[PDB]
Design an enzyme around this catalytic site. Structure first.
Site, mmCIF file in Angstrom:
data_model
loop_
_atom_site.group_PDB
_atom_site.id
_atom_site.type_symbol
_atom_site.label_atom_id
_atom_site.label_comp_id
_atom_site.label_asym_id
_atom_site.label_seq_id
_atom_site.Cartn_x
_atom_site.Cartn_y
_atom_site.Cartn_z
ATOM 1 N N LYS A 1 0.825 -1.203 0.000
ATOM 2 C CA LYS A 1 0.000 0.000 0.000
ATOM 3 C C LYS A 1 0.859 1.254 0.000
ATOM 4 C CE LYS A 1 -2.070 -1.013 3.805
ATOM 5 N NZ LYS A 1 -1.493 -2.340 4.100
ATOM 6 N N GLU B 1 1.141 5.698 10.978
ATOM 7 C CA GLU B 1 2.084 4.904 10.208
ATOM 8 C C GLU B 1 3.490 5.065 10.780
ATOM 9 O OE1 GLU B 1 0.086 2.782 8.925
ATOM 10 O OE2 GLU B 1 0.789 2.911 6.864
ATOM 11 N N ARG B 2 4.478 4.562 10.048
ATOM 12 C CA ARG B 2 5.860 4.624 10.502
ATOM 13 C C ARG B 2 6.380 6.051 10.463
ATOM 14 N NH1 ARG B 2 5.261 0.379 7.100
ATOM 15 N NH2 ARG B 2 5.661 -1.699 7.950
HETATM 16 N N1 LIG Z 1 5.453 -2.500 -6.428
HETATM 17 C C1 LIG Z 1 6.340 -3.431 -5.657
HETATM 18 N N2 LIG Z 1 7.356 -4.048 -6.256
HETATM 19 C C2 LIG Z 1 8.162 -4.886 -5.578
HETATM 20 N N3 LIG Z 1 7.988 -5.137 -4.315
HETATM 21 C C3 LIG Z 1 6.996 -4.564 -3.644
HETATM 22 C C4 LIG Z 1 6.113 -3.656 -4.345
HETATM 23 N N4 LIG Z 1 5.212 -3.238 -3.421
HETATM 24 C C5 LIG Z 1 5.516 -3.832 -2.261
HETATM 25 N N5 LIG Z 1 6.537 -4.572 -2.456
HETATM 26 C C6 LIG Z 1 7.122 -5.352 -1.400
HETATM 27 O O1 LIG Z 1 6.283 -5.222 -0.165
HETATM 28 C C7 LIG Z 1 7.250 -4.592 0.824
HETATM 29 C C8 LIG Z 1 6.545 -3.670 1.716
HETATM 30 O O2 LIG Z 1 5.420 -3.130 1.054
HETATM 31 P P1 LIG Z 1 4.690 -1.807 1.771
HETATM 32 O O3 LIG Z 1 4.825 -0.581 0.840
HETATM 33 O O4 LIG Z 1 5.390 -1.493 3.102
HETATM 34 O O5 LIG Z 1 3.094 -2.152 2.034
HETATM 35 P P2 LIG Z 1 2.283 -1.936 3.431
HETATM 36 O O6 LIG Z 1 2.255 -0.479 3.784
HETATM 37 O O7 LIG Z 1 0.868 -2.460 3.223
HETATM 38 O O8 LIG Z 1 2.915 -2.705 4.537
HETATM 39 C C9 LIG Z 1 8.217 -3.878 0.005
HETATM 40 O O9 LIG Z 1 9.453 -3.646 0.738
HETATM 41 C C10 LIG Z 1 8.445 -4.805 -1.085
HETATM 42 O O10 LIG Z 1 9.279 -5.893 -0.605
HETATM 43 MG MG LIG Z 2 2.621 1.032 5.117
#
Ligand SMILES: Nc1ncnc2c1ncn2[C@@H]1O[C@H](COP(=O)(O)OP(=O)(O)O)[C@@H](O)[C@H]1O
Ligand SMILES: [Mg+2]
Ligand SMILES: Nc1ncnc2c1ncn2[C@@H]1O[C@H](COP(=O)(O)OP(=O)(O)OP(=O)(O)O)[C@@H](O)[C@H]1O
Ligand SMILES: Nc1ncnc2c1ncn2[C@@H]1O[C@H](COP(=O)(O)OP(=O)(O)O)[C@@H](O)[C@H]1O
Ligand SMILES: [Mg+2]
Ligand SMILES: [Mg+2]
Lengths: 470, 122, 187, 487, 35, 81, 466, 105
Positions: free
Chosen positions: G154, G180-181
């Site tokens: 997300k 969030e973080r």
């Molecule tokens: N578009 C993407 N391409 C490759 N990896 C992805 C992508 N989106 C998410 N990821 C993987 O998911 C990990 C964390 O996603 P994140 O943005 O933190 O979602 P959330 O906020 O729901 O936890 C990323 O570090 C990556 O490993």
């Molecule tokens: Mg997040």
């Protein structure tokens, strides 16, 4: 009598405080100052000279301090011959706009169940003309039947077919109680009965009493309307000795209304949200619907099964109160087979070779066994297909499909749904047809010939005509 | 707040009966009678209502007794008198019961007369 | 036994004990005697000595019951209020004593026919005008009724007077008039 | 204009003062006001706060009255005066509500002025009993082929639309509303159907989009839109279905026919649960109050067909229920399924496989059935139903594929019943098994274009007599044969 | 758990039903021609 | 839903038993298409066993959740009195 | 007016007023604290006591501590002076750059726009993301929701959207970080400083930041979304500007409401949530909207607890959105990124009269073939691939190629993937998917469509594999 | 003196209801007469709910609760390196006390 005041109104639950003469539990109270009649049934004594009551009608417009009058007795309805052809509500008022029901006696809708010495052990088959019911789970004269089914499987159609067949084959003052069901269906039943001569608007030779408390009613009315209908039937059984038919659609609504008022009566919820007193309420209501030595009450009850569960506490608690349970399956209704009776889930207490005979018992058991083996062979069909089975397995599957088709029967009340005409099949015709399909006398006829016919002669005629065209 | 804090009890204490072997129904509903008094009653002891119904003292609380009723609620009203029987529930036993249909208390329900047993058992 | 309900109803622990004492005193027609004895008890316990003594929850119940019986006998109190204080001491509702006294007091005030009348005004209102107001407000009452008027001033009503006679209510402030005219113009 | 403000906006304002019966707010929070006093207030009576806010008294208790606020509780403080209005909650009803967007209490929110309504009607009236009713015979035309053929709806029926999110439920309701324009401008007065759309707990821009669609198709002139959206107080969303049902009961009682859509009843159940939990009523299954079945049952019983002695009017109800992950077995879905006269089941799998509207003909039932169809539709649709059932059994197969691709329909495209009869006929008589399944849709488009352009005679005949007589049977026989030859 | 493949209504319960109807529609055509 | 998961478990257990029996029958009839059928039914039984394991985990998870949800409903009903 | 604290239970504080009971939603100031501790009045309890929710930690509060009534709700600085600055839930600057010297202040509690202010226009917003642009396209001025469980992407997707839309945006932008973080907020701040979208030296900044993160007590986490709303609403109304509002994460609003509802004395609803979940969500969400006074395109990341889409919070959010992008963990374990579920993401402008018949037909055909593959999944899993028809095998092969081609490398994902990001125009997306559906690439392997941009890169990757 | 000192009203379920402690802060460390420590969790109009950092067996109704005036903090510094402490910073390795100069909430 005693006069109290309304002190609290929360929904359909009304607290009333009395200065002199607290009324006993189950008494009916009259709310004064209302244009229509509002009856409160005492449920609990709360202490502090207050009782908690359930309203039989809506509580809008009630005021704290409004006066309430004690009747000195439970809800008392008119009972007698003059109830026949009339429609009354939970509190005994006529709702057919045909004037007061002038009977010579009133009966309280709360009464004790018959004792143990009053029971009768006689079990005689009541032939209905329906093949699956007559064959696999026959009904008994003076027994409790019960029709289980989810929403839209055919409980109402089946109970109207039974009304048609038995109640006009009968001569003994049927009673129909509409408990928490649709008002359109109540109007439909009323007009079918007026049209079919069972209710006589003029020249009162009517033979059915109607009691109706429908969905739009508050929970108190839907919880006591079954007892009102029961009370009419009890009068017919006891103080006339008559043999009575009692039809209740739907008896699940009694329990559901109980659960709807449970929490406001101050009761910790039980499992699945039901009141803690589900079983004892169902028992005190169901133990009065019974054949005694004084007279017979043949009871047919429709029982709604929420979400097709059958392990839900309400149907599961109803099961032990019946003598011949007919279970309607949605999976069978989806096969186009009607009535949707489940042959491997319907049970009768007179399916005994010492009661119905060895021929009937053996045919029923062979039908059920071939249907169970068909259920097991369907797995191997799913994995392997139909061409890799043995030939005797194919014979089992073919005869089982034919027995499934032949269990279906067109109803008189379903011509608008089916198009086909109704058939009323005798008992020996049913036994003979199924015995022949089991013995293999029609492995040459196609399976579709047995679908939606009466006896086996209609099957051979249909097969002939399909052969002529196809 | 409080089962025994009903206004009648309090005004009777303000104005200034045997609350040892006898009680009074504070509230009755769904087969549970809250009984004031009965300060000498035992846990699981059979009691006696004024209408003849029997009960069993299951909840002994600081100010009321929770009594389960062996019958219908309509025959019990607030203010009814409850007596002690001084005994835990017991049934009749013996060979005199062979061939009889009794209820949960050893009372014949077959009309063949009273169980002529000589022994009782808790 | 049958209980005599007071004209007004109070609820809670205080309400139940006040209703009890009211019925028990109307049983013996000693309402004013017990009324003033409860006022005396309320002023006795509220002084920090007895308040700190009886509101202390680790000192034993029976000790404070004995001390309350002592202090209610020492001051020549009726048996009614004496066993009332004893009952409040056994049930541990001594904390609710001032509430019981207040509930009984408002019960006896409405038993005297005292109706709480509030007259809100934008400015400190005139005294002869206020006496004429009293005279006119006595017309909304039954007989045996007296007006306990306490007029607080709310300047935001812009004028007029908002009168509350028990639960009756007339909104004669002018701000109500302007708000009605604004609603009428906009709708 | 300074004359539109002083003419009678000032001179006529009901300046009289009254001796009011009042209470006093003990506590207020989360839209629940506990009110001291109000001794003679009735249960379900509408009360009024000193800030112009209105409330309904639901909990009559010994020491307080629990009042639910029809607005924001921010304007209510402890000690505020609560006046009695002496009346149980009611709303304006009448023909003046047609074309207007109103809120749950009947105030116009479309900025077009006040509703010149002279009649008012309680929202909690009792449904008609057994006697005033008569069987459901007149057809409620939706304009949707799958519905009008396999799940027909009559006037006075309650047909549930149930499915997951974004399966097409509002689209079914809006097609049904758009369809009634052919009758609402015609001369047959007993064929006119006045529609009512209740938006419950929806986004406000969604309701604006819906009103835009209804004004584009010129459907707003006979539609009332009751809107209790997501930012409206939970009492208003609880009360919106009953206000809409009262607005429709007016027509039902005055010999006219109305249609009401409750979109959706799940959000009304949620709002009722909120009010009940904040009124400190004990929770039940899934925290819903014990009487949520009664909530929906006393509402859906008020849809009825009346007999001649009571005017012959009707009220049809199309409640909408949203299920989670297809769980039809949940609490509120099972309640509403047990109440109504049938269900139209929509599926996500059917939606994405191209079947749109995604009606599940296997599950979708109409307990009224063929009793409320035209004879021509019945003749073609019994055959279509049997053949589609057999196709579902063996999935002839190409005829079944033709029929399914013929059941597909575009959005906002409600067809006339004569045109539906023509297309079902062309598909059920074999003139489409020559065609490959892919081009059925454009064959159908061109076919109805041609037929309405050149064969108004046959369509008018089918419209008048109601059945496809053997004369007109042979006529459209040759017409469709010629067209397929030319196609 | 007999007939639990068809009762679960999956891709296997639909495959099974399609087989039973295909095999018995061919048998019924071969049984009506002779009939 | 617990009933959906139980339906699917029952279905796949039946499929696993049938493919195992078919593997044994092909192993008997093989003593080139028979070998292919034997290995294919062995693979089908292995895949069915893996689906059975994953669905058994899901079923236990769902039944624990259902027990917890019903308890929470009863508790919240009792705490509101 | 001055009151005194009578009870402190977590984030909830009871205050008893001798004179002047403050209205509900008023902000109260606690006296005797080192920093500003604001209490927001939530309930009037009776007996001149109110129940409040603290916007900061309540440690150190003593019963009897004095509390002042401000006379108004929480008022934050609104204006063009908030652009490029970071403020917390109560409008205080948290970027150490001094006071935000705006000329007006707006309460964070306001009424939702009326029905007669709604805007119905539905022009598309191209994002450069193949699956979004094809199957569930976003609309300008609409509400976008990105659903997903823990660690499915997300934040990556919302940062890709900030990169692809907000820099190319002509108006202003507001990022509300909700629960969030904090290090993600630091990353975003510094990335926007280097990319020039925030300028520390002059007044050319185009983004306003509002942060109440997962280290904050539940009151701050419950009202910081409202603070961001207020900034965006000022830009939409008093400036008439086109606004971009990014909220990550909006589920934390509901979660914080649940945490405080525990202590506000309310009977819990389903799954322990507050009984007011839906009306709280509606009051908040109805303000995030396009009126006919200005536009707000809104992108909200919705957390899905335990991957349960039927959870009351995401299930309630579903009704407030014009476009939903539902990310799936099962799809993310197949390596397909973004993890968009193509049969669970919807849009309201997916309509032939809005996107054209070509776009609509390509999208609907893609979804048809993916649904057919999903239907075949059981037979493929047990009876292997070989027990299918030839048409089913062709469907499976094309559906797998389409699954691969829905993935795409992001420019924000370059750092941990090495592949350069791709921004695919809508024309190229429609063309590539039309061609795959036609069969023009039935000869290439499926692994050639994985993680590419346009279809020409797919054929180049196929040519470089062979 | 019920302003820096209270008496236990109830104990059980890990929470001790304390009467008094009128000047206690929210989240402040209190010290029971048994030698146990607690944290002021719920400041209420008539009592303080205290989270007991230890066994409820050691705390009785009527026990004295003194307040330490400090919001819950632990000893910090280099002097903890090599030590095994419990959740409150008390050394449980028998190597003597921690010689820390600084505490931290
Ligand atoms: N578009 C993407 N391409 C490759 N990896 C992805 C992508 N989106 C998410 N990821 C993987 O998911 C990990 C964390 O996603 P994140 O943005 O933190 O979602 P959330 O906020 O729901 O936890 C990323 O570090 C990556 O490993
Ligand atoms: Mg997040
Ligand atoms: N018959 C149809 N043909 C093509 N598209 C359709 C059809 N019906 C609906 N749709 C589209 O599928 C989507 C479903 O939206 P719709 O409002 O009709 O259903 P819904 O159940 O009310 O969804 P929700 O309640 O979650 O908003 C819409 O974008 C709609 O345009
Ligand atoms: N014996 C039957 N023959 C044909 N159709 C039937 C039969 N029973 C039920 N149905 C069909 O199923 C529908 C449900 O009828 P109903 O008796 O009201 O079921 P229930 O009362 O259990 O919900 C009917 O409207 C009808 O379409
Ligand atoms: Mg029925
Ligand atoms: Mg919708």
């Amino acid at each position: 009598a005693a006069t109290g005041r309304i002190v609290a109104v929360i929904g359909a639950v009304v607290d009333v405080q009395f200065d002199e003469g607290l009324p006993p539990i189950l008494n009916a109270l009259e709310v004064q100052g209302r244009e229509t009649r509002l009856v409160l049934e005492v449920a609990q004594h709360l202490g502090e000279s207050t009782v908690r009551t359930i309203a039989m009608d809506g509580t809008e417009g009630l005021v704290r301090g409004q006066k309430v009058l004690d009747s000195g007795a439970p809800i008392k309805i008119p009972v007698g011959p003059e109830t026949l052809g009339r429609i009354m509500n939970v509190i005994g008022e006529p709702i057919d706009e045909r004037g007061p029901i002038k009977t010579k006696q009133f009966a309280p809708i709360h009464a004790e169940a018959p004792e143990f010495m009053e029971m009768s052990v006689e079990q005689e088959i009541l032939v209905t003309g329906i093949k699956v019911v007559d064959l696999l789970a026959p009904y008994a004269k003076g027994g409790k039947i019960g029709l289980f089914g989810g929403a839209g499987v055919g409980k109402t159609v089946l109970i109207m077919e039974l009304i048609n067949n038995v109640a006009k084959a009968h001569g003994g003052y049927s009673v129909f109680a509409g408990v928490g069901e649709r008002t359109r269906e109540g109007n439909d039943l009323y007009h079918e009965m007026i049209e079919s001569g069972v209710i006589n608007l003029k020249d009162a030779t009517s033979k059915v009493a109607l009691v109706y408390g429908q969905m739009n009613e508050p929970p108190g009315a839907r919880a006591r309307v079954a007892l009102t209908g029961l009370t009419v039937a009890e009068y017919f059984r006891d103080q006339e000795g008559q043999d009575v038919l009692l039809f209740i659609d739907n008896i699940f609504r009694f329990t559901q209304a109980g659960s709807e008022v449970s929490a406001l009566l101050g009761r910790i919820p039980s499992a699945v949200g039901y009141q803690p007193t589900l079983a004892t309420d169902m028992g005190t209501m169901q133990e009065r619907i019974t054949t005694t030595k004084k007279g017979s009450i043949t009871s047919v009850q429709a029982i709604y099964v929420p979400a097709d569960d059958l392990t839900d506490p309400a149907p599961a608690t109803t099961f032990a109160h019946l003598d011949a349970t007919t279970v309607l399956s949605r999976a069978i209704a989806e096969l186009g087979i009607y009535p949707a009776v489940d042959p491997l889930d319907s049970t009768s207490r007179i399916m005994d070779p010492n009661i119905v005979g060895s021929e009937h018992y053996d045919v029923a058991r062979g039908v059920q066994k071939i249907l169970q083996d068909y259920k097991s062979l369907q797995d191997i069909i799913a994995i392997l297909g139909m061409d890799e089975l043995s030939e005797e397995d194919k014979l089992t599957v073919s005869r089982a499909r034919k027995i499934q088709r032949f269990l279906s029967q067109p109803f008189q009340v379903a011509e608008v749904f089916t198009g086909h005409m109704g058939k009323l099949v005798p008992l020996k015709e049913t036994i003979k047809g199924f015995q022949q399909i089991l013995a293999g006398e029609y492995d040459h006829l196609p399976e579709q010939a047995f679908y939606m016919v009466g006896p086996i002669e209609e099957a051979v005629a249909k097969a002939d005509k399909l052969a002529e065209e196809h | 707040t409080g089962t025994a804090e009903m206004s009648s009890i309090l005004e009777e204490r303000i104005l200034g009966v045997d609350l040892e072997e006898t009680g009074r129904v504070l509230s009755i509903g769904d087969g549970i009678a809250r009984v004031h008094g009965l300060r000498n009653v035992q846990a699981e002891e059979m009691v006696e209502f004024s209408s003849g119904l029997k009960g069993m003292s299951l909840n002994l609380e600081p100010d009321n007794v929770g009594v389960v009723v062996f019958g219908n609620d309509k025959l019990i009203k607030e203010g009814d008198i409850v007596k002690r029987t001084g005994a835990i529930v017991d049934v009749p036993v013996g060979e005199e019961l062979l061939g009889r249909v009794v209820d949960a208390l050893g009372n014949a329900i077959d009309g063949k007369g009273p169980i002529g047993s000589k022994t009782r058992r808790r | 036994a049958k209980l005599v309900r007071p004209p007004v109803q109070v609820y809670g622990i205080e309400g139940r004990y006040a209703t009890a004492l009211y019925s028990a005193a109307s049983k013996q027609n000693k309402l004013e005697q017990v009324e003033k004895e409860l006022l005396r008890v309320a002023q006795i316990l509220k002084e920090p000595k007895v308040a700190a003594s009886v509101l202390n929850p680790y000192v034993k119940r029976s000790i404070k019951v004995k001390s309350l019986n002592d202090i209610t006998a020492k001051e020549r109190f009726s048996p009614l209020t004496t066993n009332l204080i004893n009952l409040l001491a056994e049930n541990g509702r001594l904390s609710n004593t001032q509430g019981v006294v207040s509930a009984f007091s408002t019960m006896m005030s409405v038993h005297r026919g005292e109706v709480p009348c509030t007259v809100t005004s934008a400015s400190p209102l005139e005294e002869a005008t206020l006496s004429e107001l009293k005279t006119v407000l006595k017309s909304f009452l039954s007989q045996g009724q007296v007006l306990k008027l306490e007029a607080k001033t709310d300047p935001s009503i812009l004028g007029g007077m908002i009168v509350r006679i028990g639960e009756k209510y007339v909104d004669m402030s002018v701000k109500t008039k302007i708000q009605k005219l604004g609603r009428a113009m906009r709708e | 204009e300074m004359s539109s403000i002083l003419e009678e906006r000032i001179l006529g304002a009901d300046t009289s003062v009254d001796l009011e019966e009042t209470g006093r707010v003990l506590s207020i929070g989360d839209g629940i006001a506990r009110v001291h006093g109000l001794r003679n207030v009735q249960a379900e009576e509408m009360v009024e706060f000193s800030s112009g806010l209105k409330g309904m008294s639901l909990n009559l208790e010994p020491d307080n009255v629990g009042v639910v606020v029809f607005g924001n509780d921010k304007l209510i403080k402890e000690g505020d005066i609560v006046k009695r209005t002496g009346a149980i909650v009611d709303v304006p009803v009448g023909e003046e509500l047609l074309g207007r967007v109103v809120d749950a209490l009947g105030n116009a929110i479309d900025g077009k002025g006040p509703i010149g309504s002279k009649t008012r009607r309680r929202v909690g009236l009792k449904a008609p009993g057994i006697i005033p009713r008569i069987s459901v015979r007149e057809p409620m035309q939706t304009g949707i082929k799958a519905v009008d053929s396999l799940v027909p709806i009559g006037r006075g029926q309650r047909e549930l639309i149930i499915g997951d999110r974004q399966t097409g439920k509002t689209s079914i309701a809006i097609d049904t509303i758009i369809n009634q324009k052919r009758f609402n401008d015609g001369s047959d007065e007993k064929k006119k159907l006045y529609c009512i759309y209740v938006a419950i707990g929806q986004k406000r821009s969604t309701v604006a989009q819906l009103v835009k669609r209804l004004t584009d198709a010129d459907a707003m002139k006979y539609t009332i839109v009751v809107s209790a959206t997501a930012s409206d107080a939970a009492p208003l969303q609880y009360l919106a279905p009953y206000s809409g049902c009262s607005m429709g009961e007016y027509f039902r009682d005055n010999g006219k026919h109305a249609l009401i859509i409750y979109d959706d009843l799940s959000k009304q159940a949620v709002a009722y649960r909120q009010m009940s939990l904040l009124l400190r009523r004990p929770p039940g299954r899934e925290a819903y109050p014990g009487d949520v079945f009664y909530l929906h049952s006393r509402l859906l019983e008020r849809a009825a067909k009346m007999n001649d002695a009571f005017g012959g009017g009707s009220l049809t109800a199309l409640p909408v229920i949203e299920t989670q992950a297809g769980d039809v077995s949940a609490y509120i879905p099972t309640n509403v399924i047990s109440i109504t006269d049938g269900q139209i089941f929509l599926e996500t799998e059917l939606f994405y496989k191209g079947i749109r509207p995604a009606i599940n003909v296997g599950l979708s039932v109409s307990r009224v059935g063929s009793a409320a169809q035209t004879r021509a539709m019945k003749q073609v649709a019994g055959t279509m139903k049997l053949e589609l059932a057999q196709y579902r059994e063996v999935a002839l197969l190409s005829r079944g594929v033709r029929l399914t691709e013929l059941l597909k329909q575009g959005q906002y495209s409600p067809m006339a019943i004569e045109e539906q009869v023509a297309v079902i006929y062309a598909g059920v008589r074999g003139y489409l098994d020559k065609l490959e399944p892919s081009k059925i849709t454009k064959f159908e488009n061109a076919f109805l274009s041609h037929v309405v352009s050149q064969h108004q005679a046959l369509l008018g005949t089918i419209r008048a007599d109601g059945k496809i007589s053997e004369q007109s049977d042979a006529k459209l026989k040759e017409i469709v044969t010629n067209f397929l030859a030319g196609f | 758990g007999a007939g639990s493949i068809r009762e679960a209504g999956g891709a296997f319960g639909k495959r099974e039903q399609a087989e039973e109807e295909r095999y018995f529609r061919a048998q019924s055509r071969e049984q009506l021609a002779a009939l | 839903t617990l009933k959906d998961i139980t339906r699917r478990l029952k279905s796949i257990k039946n499929i696993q038993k049938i493919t195992k029996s078919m593997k044994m029958v092909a192993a008997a009839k093989y003593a080139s298409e028979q070998s292919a059928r034997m290995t294919a039914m062995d693979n089908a039984s292995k895949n069915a066993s893996e689906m059975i394991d994953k669905l058994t985990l899901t079923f236990n998870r769902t039944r624990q959740a259902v027990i917890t949800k019903e308890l929470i409903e009863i508790i919240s009903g009792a705490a509101a009195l």
